Amino acid sequence: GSETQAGIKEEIRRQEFLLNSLHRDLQGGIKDLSKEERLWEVQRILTALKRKLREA
Amino acid sequence: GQSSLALHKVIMVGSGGVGKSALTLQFMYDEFVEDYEPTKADSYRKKVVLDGEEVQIDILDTAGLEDYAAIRDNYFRSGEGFLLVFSITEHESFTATAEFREQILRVKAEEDKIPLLVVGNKSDLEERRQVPVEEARSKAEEWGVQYVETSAKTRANVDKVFFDLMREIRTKKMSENK
Numbered sequence: 343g344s345e346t347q348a349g350i351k352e353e354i355r356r357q358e359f360l361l362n363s364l365h366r367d368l369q370g371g372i373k374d375l376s377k378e379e380r381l382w383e384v385q386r387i388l389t390a391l392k393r394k395l396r397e398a
Numbered sequence: 399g400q401s402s403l404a405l406h407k408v409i410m411v412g413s414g415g416v417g418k419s420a421l422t423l424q425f426m427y428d429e430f431v432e433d434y435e436p437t438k439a440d441s442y443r444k445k446v447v448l449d450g451e452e453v454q455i456d457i458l459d460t461a462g463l464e465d466y467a468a469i470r471d472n473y474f475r476s477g478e479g480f481l482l483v484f485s486i487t488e489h490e491s492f493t494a495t496a497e498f499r500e501q502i503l504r505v506k507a508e509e510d511k512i513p514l515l516v517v518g519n520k521s522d523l524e525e526r527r528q529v530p531v532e533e534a535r536s537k538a539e540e541w542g543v544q545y546v547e548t549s550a551k552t553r554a555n556v557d558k559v560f561f562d563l564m565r566e567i568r569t570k571k572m573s574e575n576k
């Protein structure tokens with residue numbers, strides 16, 4: 343089964359997406375304090391999601 | 399309030415490799431890196447309890463080359479302390495320490511205080527030394543900081559560099575205003 347892990351994996355992908363976009367967008371030279379703080383923030387959520395994955 | 403003290407932000411930078419991935423896994427899992435590639439943006443937080451308080455240290459092993467500057471430079475903002483990790487076989491990364499320092503200064507200057515700790519990895523090479531620790535330690539004196547010899551091979555002073563820097567973060571969060 344993968345009942346609960348399914349939602350976790352999709353959430354991980356969402357957080358990876360958030361991080362990935364912020365990474366690709368900012369490498370182009372566009373960055374803002376909203377982005378920098380969110381960068382760390384979503385990162386901490388990504389790592390928490392990693393825990394959530396091995397949690398279920 | 400001490401909620402800003404139970405939370406530590408530490409960014410570890412280098413010339414590319416050096417060994418700034420192994421030290422982290424050592425301090426977290428007590429395990430040597432057998433095979434762990436990622437660490438591009440992938441990083442974990444370590445739960446440590448100092449004399450009663452469960453403290454969280456938020457670590458980032460950031461990519462630093464040119465491309466993914468959005469992971470190295472763009473992440474520098476939300477980081478209290480910085481670990482400059484190089485090896486004494488590389489005179490280049492030794493010279494680059496000043497570059498990293500100023501990179502941080504360019505993004506952080508109007509805040510309280512920037513805790514810097516220079517970490518020398520691979521004190522197990524010895525004879526392969528291309529840059530004398532004598533001037534490296536002199537740089538510590540130059541910047542008013544500390545220089546510590548470490549290695550994930552022998553597993554020495556790994557705890558020190560992590561705890562030591564995080565403790566300074568408390569002093570920065572308490573501020574001076576004297």
Ligand SMILES: Nc1nc2c(ncn2[C@@H]2O[C@H](COP(=O)(O)OP(=O)(O)NP(=O)(O)O)[C@@H](O)[C@H]2O)c(=O)[nH]1
Nearest residue numbers: 415416417418419420435436437519520549550551
């Ligand atoms: N101190 C020390 N570290 C060692 C020794 N042998 C291997 N290592 C560790 O092996 C790890 C491998 O480093 P490196 O090849 O740069 O990995 P990386 O480039 O960060 N991987 P990636 O580029 O995918 O993120 C380092 O963290 C280093 O500390 C040794 O003899 N001494």
Ligand SMILES: [Mg+2]
Nearest residue numbers: 419435436437
């Ligand atoms: Mg790595």
